[PDB]
C-alpha cells in the first residue's frame with residue numbers, strides 16, 4: 001500500500017496506458033514483445049522522461065521473473081552513467097488488481113545511432129559499476145546508450161525484443177557487437193562490445209558488419225589475426241578444430257584502419273578487441289589507460305553496493321514473482337530531488 005492508491009490521479013489513453021496525471025504528452029518511441037516505451041513530460045519535476053509499460057508482466061513465468069529482475073536491477077542502479085529509476089507505478093489499488101508495471105526514467109537527448117574519449121570514458125565508468133555488482137550487460141550497442149545535450153551518457157537496455165541470433169533493431173544487427181566467444185562456443189564480453197562501438201564513433205561505420213556468423217568471424221580475424229597457441233587450448237568445444245583450420249592471417253596495423261586517430265585510442269582498441277577473453281582489458285583497467293588521463297579519477301569511479309541476486313536460482317510460482325514485485329513497487333522511493 002501506497003499514497004497513489006488513494007489519490008485519483010490515473011488517466012487512460014491508447015497508445016492502452018494508465019498513468020498518473022503528472023505524466024503528459026505521451027509519445028511512442030519503441031515497442032516489442034516484452035513492452036513499450038513512451039517519452040513524456042512530467043509536470044511535477046518539469047523534466048522530460050521515458051516510461052516503459054511491461055507487456056503482460058505476470059502472464060508467464062518468463063515475463064514474471066523478468067519483470068522482477070528488471071525492477072530489482074533498476075532500483076539498485078545509482079550511477080550517473082547508468083539508467084536510474086525516477087519512478088515505478090501501477091494503476092492497481094491492491095494486489096488483486098496488480099496486473100501492470102510501469103517504470104520511469106530520464107529521457108536523454110537521443111542515443112548513438114574530444115567527444116569519443118568522453119563518451120567511451122563514460123561507458124567504461126558505467127561498466128565498472130555494472131560489472132562490480134556482478135551483472136553482465138550482454139547487448140551493448142549504440143541504441144542501448146542514451147546521451148543528452150552535453151554528450152553525458154547512460155547505459156541502458158531497452159529489452160523490448162526476444163534475443164535471437166538474427167536479431168535486429170532498426171537497421172543494425174546485434175551480432176555485429178557480439179563477443180566471438182558467445183557467438184561460437186567472462187564479463188569482458190561487454191568490453192568487446194565497447195570496442196566495436198568506439199570504432200564506429202571514430203570512423204562513422206560499423207566495424208564488423210557480418211552478413212552471418214562465418215562472415216562475422218572472417219571479418220574479425222581479418223582485423224585482429226587468427227588465434228595463437230594459448231587461446232586455442234582454452235577453447236573447450238573440440239569443433240577449436242574449425243578456427244585452427246583457418247589459414248593464419250596477420251593482425252592489421254590498427255593505426256591505418258583508424259586513420260588519424262589518437263595513438264592512445266588505437267592502443268586502447270587493440271587491448272579491447274583481443275580474441276582471448278582472459279587477456280582482454282577490463283572496465284577498471286581501461287579507465288586507467290592514459291587515453292582518458294583528462295577524465296580519470298579512480299575515486300570518482302565507484303563500484304556498486306552488494307547486489308543480492310539469490311532470486312535468480314529460485315523456482316517460484318508466477319504469483320510469488322508478482323507479489324515480490326508488488327512489494328518493490330510499493331516501497332519504491334524517488335531519488336533526492
Ligand SMILES: CC(C)(C)c1cc(NC(=O)Nc2cccc(Cl)c2Cl)n(-c2ccccc2)n1
Pocket residue numbers: 037050051052066069070073074077083103104105130135136137155156157158159
Ligand atoms: C542495468 C542494465 C543491465 C543496463 C539494464 C537496464 C535495463 N532496463 C532498461 O534500460 N529499461 C529501460 C530502457 C529505456 C527506457 C526505460 Cl523507461 C527503461 Cl525502464 N535492464 C533490463 C533488465 C531486464 C529486462 C530488460 C531490461 N538492464
